[PDB]
């Protein structure tokens, strides 16, 4: 099960060769190699039973990490004002990390989480980064708030889910005000346009049963054109209009071509693969426009670092490894792998990245040094924070548990779906903007629901480096919440049981 996932300690560590051509990139790379490899040399190999005397023990320090996150439920120092427009993310990073670590919140604390987030919800539609009397709605806080309510809420009158259900029409209307004719979305009124917005919006629309044809038009084309010559995805694509020199450069619904606007990055590659995957559930004709899945898988695996850098992932070519890309790049691997599997199936098994080395990076390099604040971090030399704690642990989960999208599970889901149950259909902004009829709408609901619940952990595919006390819970690819949160949440909004 580990034939093709060699431990970092079993491989020869050597620097990236210089070719006798120094540059600023190489100076920074070599300095980082020395930082990571020195910490590995001080740390007992997690795979050994005879832990060397005098060497640091790499076990996951779950109680230190729990106490690190505990400040979220009391108070954060003044320096966090830099995240005052992202407080739903502070909630999400905390409550999802506790789910992964296996630590339960009591009901009173969950009720405080629910109440805080509901004060961020505007009657006109969507969540902001703070109270609705202070901040306007934003697509990224809307994703973080919705996922946090999946983790901490419930179906009772104080559980927050009924407020989400009542807000479905207004949230949909917010999503349509964000929509551009070329398939992009602004993240907020007057805000930037990139695949982070598309990803956050498609997750929420999928979970709350508010997808329509008018919402999705050109969304597949925007995302597909973000793929670069390296195989990963950039932040956005530019729509050039039908007429060369134009009096306007504002996006149009029928551009002559689209061009990606920057280099492939793990964060935008994660958002693009996940968005594309969500779109493949939608039964529209010749939709979604395809991507080059093999190139995206190749890009994904090429970002895993060498043994001297501990087998962590970097975010882009010739930059540095960083624990948070365990989720952004590592968590895209099962999505890319499934899309490759479908391509091979249409034209007519070993792990795809080093699942062992990624765990060794998490345990050895990404944990705060023992006996201290706890928390996980980017790399040695960096302070831990809630964002690296969440994303280190989410990526560790994908490495520990072999995830795949199961066609037979999706078939079973279709067989059990009850199309006579559901919340009221959203009213489209344009008269012809909805599904053509009720047969079409119910078929769409069935496919989107059944595929959202199609991810499974493969029996016998578990690999827990360092022993079973390092095991954390299983996150879901695409949504990044536990399956035991996803299922009752999405079932509530589709009225399934």
């Amino acid at each position: 099960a580990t034939e093709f996932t060699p431990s970092v300690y079993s491989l020869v560590s050597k620097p990236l060769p210089s070719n006798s051509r120094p540059s600023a990139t190489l100076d920074e790379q070599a300095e980082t190699e020395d930082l990571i490899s020195q910490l590995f040399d001080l740390t007992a190999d997690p795979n050994a039973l005879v832990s060397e005397h005098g060497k640091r023990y790499s076990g996951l320090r779950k109680q230190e990490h729990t106490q690190f996150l505990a400040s979220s439920f009391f108070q954060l120092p003044g320096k966090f004002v830099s995240l005052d427009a992202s407080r739903p993310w502070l909630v999400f990073w905390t409550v999802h990390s506790l789910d992964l670590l296996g630590v339960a919140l009591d009901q009173g604390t969950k009720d405080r989480v629910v109440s805080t987030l509901l004060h961020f919800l505007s009657p006109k539609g969507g969540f902001g980064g703070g109270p609705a009397n202070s901040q306007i709605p934003h697509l990224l806080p809307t994703y973080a708030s919705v996922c946090s309510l999946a983790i901490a809420g419930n179906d009772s009158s104080t559980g927050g889910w009924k407020d989400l259900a009542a807000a479905r029409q207004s949230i949909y209307e917010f999503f349509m005000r964000c929509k551009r004719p070329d398939g992009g979305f602004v993240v907020c009124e007057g805000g930037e346009v990139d695949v982070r917005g598309t990803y956050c919006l498609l997750v929420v629309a999928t979970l709350l049963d508010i997808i329509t044809p008018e919402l999705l038009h050109n969304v597949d084309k925007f995302v597909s054109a973000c793929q670069t010559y390296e195989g990963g995805f950039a932040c956005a694509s530019f729509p050039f209009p039908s007429v060369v020199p134009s009096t306007s450069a504002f996006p149009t619904s029928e551009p002559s071509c689209r061009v990606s606007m920057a280099e492939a990055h793990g964060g935008y590659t994660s958002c693009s693969l996940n968005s594309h995957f969500l779109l493949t559930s939608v039964p529209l004709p010749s939709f979604p426009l395809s991507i080059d899945a093999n190139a995206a898988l190749r890009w994904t695996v090429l970002q895993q670092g060498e043994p001297i850098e501990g087998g962590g992932f970097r975010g882009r070519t010739n930059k540095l490894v960083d624990g948070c890309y365990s989720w952004w790049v590592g968590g895209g691997a099962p999505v890319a792998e499934e899309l490759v599997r479908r391509e091979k199936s249409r034209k007519v098994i070993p792990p795809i990245f080093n699942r062992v080395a990624l765990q060794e990076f998490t345990l050895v390099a990404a944990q705060q040094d023992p006996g201290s604040t706890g928390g996980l971090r980017d790399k040695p030399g960096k302070r831990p924070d809630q964002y690296h704690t969440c994303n280190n642990l989410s990526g560790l989960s994908i490495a520990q548990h072999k995830m795949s999208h199961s066609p037979s599970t999706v078939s079973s889901n279709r067989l059990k779906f009850d199309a006579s149950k559901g919340l009221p259909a959203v009213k489209p902004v344009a008269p012809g903007g909805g599904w053509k009829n009720e047969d079409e709408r119910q078929n769409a609901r069935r496919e989107i629901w059944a595929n959202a619940l199609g991810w499974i952990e493969e029996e016998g595919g578990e690999i827990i480096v360092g022993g079973k006390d390092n095991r954390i819970n299983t996150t879901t690819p695409v949504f990044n919440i536990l399956g035991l949160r996803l299922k009752p949440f999405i079932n509530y909004f589709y009225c399934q049981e």
Partner: protein
């Protein structure tokens, strides 16, 4: 010492509005007195929808303390257009923010909205500012994405001349000379030479581009940026791999550039991405067993971090 706004004559008519968190919120932030006071009055300003100079001054105070505060940036831009403020002065203020390390998505997007609304007949001086701004961080992702947007938006309006495209490639070539491992500059070169709608595609340009790529590899044989650009180039233009194999084979132990007769020092062999080129070359020739043997060695000997991926490639051959 700090003078609260409740004690300021210019603000005596304004009743501040407290943040509405509810009774016992999670993730509360212990705000400085200055930040809480400014937000208390911003809440009142934005509630009454006042568009004024004092509101403008207030938004600057707030984004200096929190540059990622998208709501206050949104209000600031509507103030600028509503008051018909000098957008060139605002652009100079954004230059100072960069100097003072006040940075976020929101600052970069604000800069984009300014350029879009100014709509200069010639954006040359903004292009030159962006070039200089890269000195402290030549890989700043927001800067490279903004540069792409700038050339794409203003070329759509017909305002990028041939002399401007030429000097942009000259600048790009210098960036890659100073650091051949700058993957952001490789991405820019791809826009300039391949993907932008105005790029030339002739047999001369394809040959020129291949010469530049090959020379780059021979200068830095272990540079992943150069190998990825080569593979993307050949794939995008449906060009065969075999005729170029002479320039690649020395790394797996005619007309286009060849490796140095003594290879550069600190160039251990084989180069794993050269082996990938060789394997894919075998596949191009339908020699699937020769490709499989290369993948097997990548998997068990030469690129063991990716042993499972290279084994996946080996099995595909059967």
């Amino acid at each position: 010492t700090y003078i609260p706004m409740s004690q300021r004559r210019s603000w005596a008519d304004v009743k501040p509005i407290m943040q509405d968190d509810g009774p016992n919120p999670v993730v509360p932030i212990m705000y400085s007195e200055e930040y809480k006071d400014a937000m208390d009055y911003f809440r009142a300003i934005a509630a009454k929808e006042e568009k004024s100079e004092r509101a403008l001054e207030l938004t600057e105070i707030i984004v200096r303390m929190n540059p990622a505060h998208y709501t206050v940036w949104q209000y600031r831009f509507s103030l600028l257009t509503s008051l018909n403020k000098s957008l060139e002065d605002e652009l100079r203020l954004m230059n100072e923010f960069a100097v003072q390390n006040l940075k976020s998505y929101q600052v970069w997007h604000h800069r984009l909205l300014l350029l879009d609304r100014i709509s200069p007949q010639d954006p040359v001086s903004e292009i030159e500012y962006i070039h200089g701004s890269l000195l402290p961080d030549p890989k700043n992702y927001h800067t490279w994405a903004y540069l792409h947007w700038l050339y794409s938006h203003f070329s759509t309006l017909g305002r990028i001349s041939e002399a401007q495209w030429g000097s942009e490639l000259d600048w790009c070539n210098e960036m890659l000379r100073v650091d051949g491992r700058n993957n952001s500059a490789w991405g820019w070169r791809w826009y300039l030479r391949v993907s932008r709608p105005g790029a030339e595609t002739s047999s001369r340009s394809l040959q020129d581009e291949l010469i530049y790529i090959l020379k780059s590899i021979h200068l830095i044989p272990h540079n992943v940026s150069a190998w990825n650009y080569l593979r993307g180039f050949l794939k995008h233009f449906s060009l065969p791999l075999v005729p170029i194999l002479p320039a690649i084979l020395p790394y797996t132990a005619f007309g286009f550039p060849m490796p140095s007769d003594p290879l550069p020092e600190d160039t251990p062999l084989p180069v794993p991405l050269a082996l990938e080129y060789l394997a894919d070359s075998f596949i191009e020739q339908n020699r699937v067993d020769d490709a499989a043997k290369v993948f097997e060695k990548l998997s068990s000997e030469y690129d063991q971090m990716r042993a499972g991926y290279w084994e996946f490639r080996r099995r595909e051959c059967a």
